[PDB]
Design a protein around this ligand. Sequence first.
Ligand code: NI
Lengths: 119, 87
Amino acid sequence: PGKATGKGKPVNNKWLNNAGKDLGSPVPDRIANKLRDKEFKSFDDFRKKFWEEVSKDPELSKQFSRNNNDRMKVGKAPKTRTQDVSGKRTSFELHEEVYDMDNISVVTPKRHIDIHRGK
Amino acid sequence: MELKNSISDYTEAEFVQLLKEIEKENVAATDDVLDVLLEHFVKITEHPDGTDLIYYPSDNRDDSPEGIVKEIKEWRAANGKPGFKQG
Ligand code: NI
């Protein structure tokens, strides 16, 4: 329960291309502008709003398939490529390094496991 | 709907219905049911990239139910596996 803060970072036409490396992809600045100062009941609530805004940003939505845009439209994370999955974790996750968007990044489940396991 | 045990039990039209069922669950609040339908899809298609056919379609084909069936039909035929039911 809190407000979203942060500026995020500029992104290109291949936003999630590096979600499987280092700390993943940053919250897009345009998305940060849409969520900044808004209040959220929970992280899950923040996450749904986040993906919904992504589906509304033409430059970001064009980077996903129709099936993935439908998922984001209702606030669910897009599915990752088969090779980036980890067991039952098959969609992008938000990693945290009250809701500071400059400390939130998009990562694949595989890369997320490694980050937390010291890799 | 009814989940058949193999592609040979599916007509192309019936496979498309399975794809629209998956599309409906994409917009459901959770992925509980979706994930079972996706596991079934992966299991019967036998394509190495599994769910990528749905969520990460190749640019050389259409991103639609018709394009997914077509890609599956060409891949199966090319690998000598049984195709969709002709009924
Ligand atoms: Ni994390």
